[PDB]
Design a protein around this ligand. Structure first.
Ligand code: CDL
Ligand code: PC1
Ligand code: 3PE
Ligand code: 3PE
Ligand code: 3PE
Ligand code: 3PE
Ligand code: HEC
Ligand code: HEC
Ligand code: HEM
Ligand code: HEM
Ligand code: HEM
Ligand code: HEM
Ligand code: FES
Lengths: 380, 241, 74, 147, 380, 144
């Protein structure tokens, strides 16, 4: 008789958010993915209120951005909220991925694959969105990334000309990047619905890695109020970042208009790309660097086939815990190296960091799992 | 040269977390820009209406806008004509195109100073270090004529002549126009020119800090209520053996 | 499909809970929190901290080596 | 907090300071004599303003309302009949009318040959309507602010 | 082994919706039309995406950007005229779909019907703002007319219209926000159509007889799949002979001039899918009453579930109400013809009689006819 | 836009280099007067519509880029307008600067009758009668 279990619109809400059985012991890290959804929604809303005054022509892009920040009522709040929300979105995304790696959540293979497709989509969305304000570093980072994407033999030059709409980054590139940056978050939202559907088919994972069917609680009100508290905390960091220091994560050189004649002495993207850029500087080969970038994103999708243990989480695997924190440390090292000049000693440090990164993910972690199985009297 | 020199951290009155700008300094720096810096530099994204309620009143900014001529048009015979400026007009160009600016300044183009403290490392401190930092070049370097030695400019060869000296202009409020005072006032004004929303942003940040300091413990209290339903749960086992 | 009532088969387990209006929201907060925070720190600090310590060491070494590289060589 | 942020976004969707700057910043001066009609640029449109006399007030009041192509009397146009403030736009094709001409002493459109009176009512031509009277507010009597 | 079609968590939805969905065997070609609508919807989106890749929402560079699409972009004329003529064909399929729902008694599915009315409002708003977008003369003046009649609302109409405008008239703020809203609205229409199909699939579809069709039901594949491919190809035939042979028989010539606020056109009218609404508006000598009558015309279309006073569902065996239905359809054709005419003799009295008969047939005469045939068949 | 339609690249290049186009600014910051190129648009007679209205006595001559698609009748309207200039009937008086064309709305156009017999010379030896010139320019405007 009740509309919660009978009405077909409310039935999906009931079985996804109200009466969904959830483990009672999942920590605050399980907030983060839900935070990601809110971040995406927030970005879309702010993006819509940025689309109401942005003009996507090269003569009136930077001027339209200054008109947003100077004449539109609280347009500075909307634009800097959009930029710092993108940064906080990548913070939540990195912690969501690292939690999936630590607690063995990649055994949900379809959920993991939809996740890495979402990661590729949001990285492309962020890159094109940074191209959009048409600053100096926007135009020069776009030119650098596309002309290194031109490194595929016999296909690369035609592909980068068709991506550019011409010989370089120009008005056609800006218009098509505005259209593509508009269209991508809705595809991201649909893929997030498929992500949640693939998760809810099999249930979620607890930090101990055991079977949580012995003790499960309804999602409401427990994780409802936990997610509300997480949303409030995320809004605290986001509003502190937008209302006190709007430029620790930005670049001053993007406040100059785009000059094709002038190249900057240092060209770098944002920090969530920077470590990948460090890998892109690690190998002195064009095509090898491009494949290093693509495999540096795709070995996360490869890791469900790298599980050689009979225990799921890392809570009872201390050597792989140490090696995982060495991996996160190496990621911080690569993030620092990516924003450094191409000069000694950063070359050998970046090469050592990339070698350590691929060695830890590819080689050392299954060996650590095998010897942990041997020491627990499991492996022959 | 390749080696650089980072500007230090000057203790501005707006350096703090909730400390707003000094609007008398912004008014004095606007007078500095109008009397000194407007001959070579432009302020394309600031109009005369932005000064109302920040440094000047409505009639004072109206007089400031009326003091300059704007090429408006076209007329009914299709001609451009001079008109007195109004409050909706932006600050006037020194040169119509950057090519004449490069011609009149020996190749170097003076940048539009609407974001020059937002587009430089170190902010307006660097601007202060550019203005009070001119000195005699050391032995070893011999820069080309038409250039000047400034250790804070990258490459240490700036195309800008030193624009500030003592009593370069007069102040209407009877403030002594020393070179350091004029540089500090124009740095405050250029900080305002990049962030007109600075004081409002800090006020909203103060309200946000108080508001979140109110609501983090309260939301934590409701969470601890609903989850202390479960956090005192006691479980027992009765196997029949 | 995977709702309550058919998740797992559990026999002979007794569970006790109170109303939230009978118990405190923060019952003995710091007296049972600071020992538990110190205990969790004790169990995890030797596996978390030394990678970040050696990252800090490599970062400071790289900064000072960059500054020495920019320095003159008489 | 929710009411505040909803107010922020709603105020963002409203009129910006740039479009609010282009209205209500016009100052009509007192150096304009009797009978001299000139155009100001208001809201991207021409605006004819002229100072008149009582003779033209009685002349415009002598024109009936029911027989008009567009029925409007002089007091319903302006509450100060000695000041005439209309829009100097041809209502048919968009040309610029030329004031102080014709039988009744008003606007003339040269693109097709339209004759207007001093108030702005249609008297000859293909225009099927009158000239729209903009709203205005009263400062000290030297200055009237249109809009 | 297992059946991958029915057990995969993603393929189960496609299997339940388009493969093994039980459908009535005797549904006619009108049952193609709604599926065609969905196809036409995505066609619009695809063409719109490419029209977003070269268009600049700015009053100085909107018309010039449209001419640049038509002349300089490779086959840009084809994609633009496909977008416009597919909007017209989208409304053709819309009116035939709604007429199918009215004739065959498909409005007894009340939630599906009201969701569809919401979709109808959303697509009408999307098409109105999209027609404003190329910034011709008729675009600017139609936007002015619609916003003025919105400003006819007492005491909140002026504030709402100056907040929709972003200013004191139609300007580049209005153009940019109309571009943003016209971009984002079809994805809302797509999600709402997903909800529309969800409610229909949980209530089942209807046969033209109106009887219980559970005795004779067939799978959707391969009957209605190939039937909808044939309908899609016929819809492509009509769309392609409209785009390739008569590109401007439905378009407005005055839209090919740049927008001028100083010059008003001698005749101002919206497009042909708004003309019956405009003729209903123009008949009543009260602007608040006219807007009230327009909104309540679409709302009495929404209210049509509550006027069903007959024991038979479809109009297959109800010839008096069939006659009244065809009087209503011909009256809609009359209102469409009157809406493109000026306010001259004898169009005022014809439009007033047309609107009076439209409201009388929808509200009064159809339940009276249903009661008459109920008595006449000895049903009560 | 004329190459591959009516002219070769050499003929269209010569046509472009016939007319002069303002271009710049130079390194000194002044606008110079260069010969035209293939990428250049067709030269405007007036820089702004205000001098267009001044030179043509109030009336602004419109852009004939979509003048076929902006008018009812298409090129039939252009052909009837150019070959329909007739004397006004009795009962209507026409002021100086206006001309009677019944296909114009209001029947009093401000355009002087532009074409007559042998108004120009054709390259291919076609007899340049008024109706032939009007038909050719209507075909060209339909192409435009
Ligand atoms: C430290 C001194 C206090 C102390 O020892 O408290 C004991 C207590 C732990 O004692 P316990 O009983 O052993 O632990 C169970 C908790 O009581 C049960 O609480 P809990 O640990 O499950 O808390 C849930 C978690 C929920 O966390 C979230 O929702 C955060 C989600 C992520 C947001 C983004 C973070 C990353 C941003 C990067 C940029 O809360 C927090 O992480 C802190 C919330 C603070 C709210 C404001 C309090 C005033 O520590 C805290 O509560 C620490 C936070 C407050 C200080
Ligand atoms: C190994 C050495 C470890 C040393 C430290 C731990 C042992 C000594 C602890 C001494 C008591 C500290 C305070 C105890 C406490 O929680 O008091 C507050 C408790 C409960 O107070 P409360 O929990 O309401 O405190 C407010 C808590 N917040 C801010 C989160 C809302 O008891 C009393 O107030 C009485
Ligand atoms: C930072 C917090 C570090 C920390 O506290 O680590 C210790 C904590 C221990 O948790 P656990 O081992 O589950 O045991 C709990 C008690 N039995 O362990 C954890 O809290 C585990 C945290 C897992 C997620 C860490 C993500 C760090 C950021 C990774 C970014 C890059 C991800 C990969 C990208 C490619
Ligand atoms: C902030 C600075 C100060 C921080 C605080 C310092 C400590 C103060 C408090 C100490 C309290 C100790 C209480 C008992 C803690 C026991 C911790 C523990 O479980 O240690 C086992 C851990 C993992 O051992 P395992 O990986 O099996 O060893 C093989 C080597 N890989 O073994 C280890 O963790 C030891 C080996 C670590 C190797 C790191 C290599 C980095 C490269
Ligand atoms: C239209 C052309 C003529 C169509 C025609 O011949 O329709 C007759 C047909 C009879 O069908 P029926 O009586 O069910 O079956 C007889 C035996 N099978 O009847 C039908 O097929 C009726 C189904 C189509 C009804 C819609 C036709 C008009 C389209 C516009 C409707 C607008 C409705 C209002 C929308 C805005 C509000
Ligand atoms: C007889 C055939 C002679 C020619 C031979 C060739 C063959 C032709 C077909 C022969 C068919 C034989 C019979 C089989 C068909 C089924 C029966 C049928 O259709 O009968 C005709 C029908 C009778 O009415 P019926 O619906 O059967 O029942 C009503 C209750 N007495 O009658 C009707 O439906 C008549 C409907 C008339 C409607 C007139 C409407 C007038 C007003 C219109 C206003 C509309 C516009 C309003 C605008 C307002 C604003 C300006
Ligand atoms: C004409 C003599 C000028 C006067 C008056 C002012 N400036 Fe200038 N400035 C001028 C030139 C030719 C240049 C470019 C020199 C170059 O090598 O690029 C500049 C540059 C600046 C800059 C930018 C410095 C940078 O690192 O990008 C700043 C911040 C600047 N000038 C400040 C400034 C101020 C505050 C002035 C008023 C006192 C002022 N300038 C006047 C030429 C001239
Ligand atoms: C200067 C004497 C002109 C010559 C040479 C040509 N035209 Fe013209 N035309 C001229 C003016 C001043 C106007 C403005 C409208 C008016 O009131 O007269 C026009 C208008 C047109 C139009 C538009 C007609 C309409 O109804 O909008 C067309 C289609 C047109 N003119 C065609 C045309 C052609 C084909 C010409 C070359 C033979 C030509 N004009 C020359 C003035 C002048
Ligand atoms: C469909 C929704 C979105 C729209 C309409 C949108 C629109 C815009 C616009 C107009 C800009 C330029 C204005 C500016 O300078 O900030 C922009 C910038 C940006 N966007 Fe988005 N955006 C959307 C979603 C996202 C998402 C999901 C991300 C995160 C991946 C994102 C990341 C960015 C970034 C990083 C910038 C650059 C910020 C800056 O340089 O100022 N956007 N976006
Ligand atoms: C686009 C950004 C993303 C969004 C919006 C998103 C959304 C979500 C949501 C809502 C959940 C369920 C709540 C939770 O468990 O925390 C979830 C869980 C999960 N996500 Fe994501 N996710 C994103 C990115 C990713 C990525 C990149 C991966 C792959 C590394 C991933 C893998 C997972 C896994 C494995 C789980 C389930 C683990 C568990 O429930 O214990 N997600 N995600
Ligand atoms: C999200 C998908 C869509 C996008 C991105 C989009 C984008 C655009 C753009 C850029 C234009 C201006 C181009 C031009 O007309 O010269 C336009 C025009 C138009 N759009 Fe859309 N549109 C979309 C969906 C739709 C839909 C669903 C309809 C309704 C069926 C529609 C109806 C129209 C109409 C009627 C025009 C005016 C065409 C004309 O110039 O005559 N659009 N659209
Ligand atoms: C906006 C575009 C629309 C789309 C894409 C759409 C889509 C569909 C689809 C795919 C079906 C199932 C196939 C069929 O039986 O025709 C359907 C059926 C239906 N739709 Fe829509 N629809 C639209 C508009 C509307 C509107 C405006 C209404 C309300 C008048 C409506 C009411 C219905 C009803 C009542 C049915 C069930 C008819 C039956 O199956 O017997 N739809 N629609
Ligand atoms: S053009 Fe002015 S009255 Fe016709």
């Amino acid at each position: 008789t009740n509309m919660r279990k009978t009405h077909p619109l409310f039935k999906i809400i009931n079985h996804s958010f109200i009466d969904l059985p959830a483990p009672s012991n999942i920590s605050s890290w399980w907030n983060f993915g839900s935070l990601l959804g809110v971040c995406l929604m927030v970005q879309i809303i702010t993006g819509l209120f940025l689309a109401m005054h942005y003009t996507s022509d090269t003569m009136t892009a930077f001027s339209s951005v200054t008109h947003i920040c100077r004449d539109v009522n609280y347009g500075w709040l909307i634009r800097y909220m959009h930029a710092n929300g993108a940064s906080m979105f990548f913070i939540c995304l990195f912690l969501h991925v690292g939690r999936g790696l630590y607690y063995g959540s990649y055994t949900f293979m379809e959920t993991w694959n939809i996740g890495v497709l979402l990661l590729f989509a949001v990285m492309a969305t962020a890159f094109m969105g940074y191209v959009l304000p048409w600053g100096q570093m926007s135009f020069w980072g776009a030119t650098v990334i596309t002309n290194l994407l031109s490194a595929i033999p016999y296909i690369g030059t035609t592909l980068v000309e068709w991506i550019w709409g011409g010989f370089s980054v120009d008005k056609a590139t800006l218009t098509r990047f505005f259209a593509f940056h508009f269209i991508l978050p809705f595809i991201i939202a649909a893929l997030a619905i498929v992500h949640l559907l693939f998760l809810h088919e099999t249930g979620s994972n607890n930090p101990t890695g055991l079977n949580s069917d012995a003790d499960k609680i309804p999602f409401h009100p427990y994780y409802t109020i936990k997610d509300i508290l997480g949303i409030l905390i995320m809004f605290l960091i986001l509003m502190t970042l937008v209302l006190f220091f709007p430029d620790m994560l930005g670049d001053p050189d993007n406040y100059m208009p785009a000059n094709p004649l002038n190249t900057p002495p240092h060209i770098k993207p944002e920090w969530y790309f920077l470590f990948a850029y460090a890998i892109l500087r690690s190998i002195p080969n064009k095509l090898g660097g491009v494949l290093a970038l693509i495999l540096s994103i795709l070995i996360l999708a490869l890791m469900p086939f790298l599980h050689t243990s009979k225990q799921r989480s890392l809570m009872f695997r201390p050597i792989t815990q140490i090696l995982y924190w060495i991996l996160v440390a190496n990621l911080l090292i690569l993030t620092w190296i990516g924003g450094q000049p191409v000069e000694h000693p950063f070359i050998i440090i970046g090469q050592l960091a990339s070698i350590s990164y691929f060695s830890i993910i590819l080689i050392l972690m299954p060996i650590s799992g095998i010897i942990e199985d041997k020491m627990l009297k499991l492996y022959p | 040269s390749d080696l650089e020199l980072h500007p230090p951290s000057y203790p501005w009155s707006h350096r703090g977390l909730l400390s707003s700008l000094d609007h008398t300094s912004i008014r004095r720096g606007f007078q500095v820009y109008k009397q000194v810096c407007s001959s070579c530099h432009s302020m394309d994204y600031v109009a005369y209406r932005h000064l109302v309620g920040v440094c000047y009143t409505e009639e004072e900014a109206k007089a400031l806008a009326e003091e300059v001529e704007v090429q408006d048009g076209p007329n009914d015979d299709g001609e451009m004509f001079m008109r007195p400026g109004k409050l909706s007009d932006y600050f006037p160009k020194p040169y119509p195109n950057p090519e004449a600016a490069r011609a009149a300044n020996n190749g170097a183009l003076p940048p539009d100073l609407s974001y020059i403290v937002r587009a430089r490392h170190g902010g307006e401190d660097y601007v202060f270090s550019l203005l009070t930092g001119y000195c005699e070049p050391p032995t070893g370097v011999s820069l080309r004529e038409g250039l000047y030695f400034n250790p804070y400019f990258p490459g240490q060869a700036i195309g800008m002549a030193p624009p500030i000296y003592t009593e370069v202009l007069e102040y209407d409020d009877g403030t002594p126009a020393t070179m350091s005072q004029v540089a500090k006032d124009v740095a405050t004004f250029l900080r305002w020119a990049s962030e007109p929303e600075h004081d409002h942003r800090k006020r909203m940040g103060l309200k946000m800090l108080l508001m979140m300091g109110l609501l983090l413990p309260l939301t934590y209290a409701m969470k601890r209520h609903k989850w202390s339903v479960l956090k005192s749960r006691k479980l027992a086992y009765r196997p029949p053996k | 499909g995977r709702e309550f009532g058919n998740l797992a088969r559990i026999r002979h387990v007794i569970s006790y809970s109170l109303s939230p209006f009978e118990q405190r929201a923060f019952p003995s907060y710091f007296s049972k929190g600071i020992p538990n925070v110190l205990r969790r720190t004790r169990e995890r600090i030797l596996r978390v901290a030394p990678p970040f310590v050696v990252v800090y060491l490599i970062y400071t070494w790289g900064n000072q080596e960059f500054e020495q590289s920019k320095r003159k060589n008489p | 907090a929710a009411k505040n942020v909803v107010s922020q976004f709603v105020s963002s969707m409203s009129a910006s300071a740039d479009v609010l700057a282009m209205s209500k910043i016009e100052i009509k001066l007192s150096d304009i004599p009797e009978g001299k009609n000139m155009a100001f640029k208001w809201r991207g449109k021409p605006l004819f303003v002229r100072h008149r006399t009582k003779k033209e007030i009685d002349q415009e009041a002598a024109v009936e309302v029911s027989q008009l192509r567009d029925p409007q009397h002089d007091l319903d146009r302006v509450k100060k009949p000695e000041w005439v403030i209309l829009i100097g736009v041809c209502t048919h094709l968009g040309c610029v009318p030329i004031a102080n001409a014709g039988d009744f002493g008003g606007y003339y459109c040269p693109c097709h040959g339209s004759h207007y009176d001093a108030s702005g009512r249609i008297r000859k031509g293909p225009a099927p309507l009158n000239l729209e009277v903009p709203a205005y507010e009263f400062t000290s009597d030297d200055v009237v602010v249109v809009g």
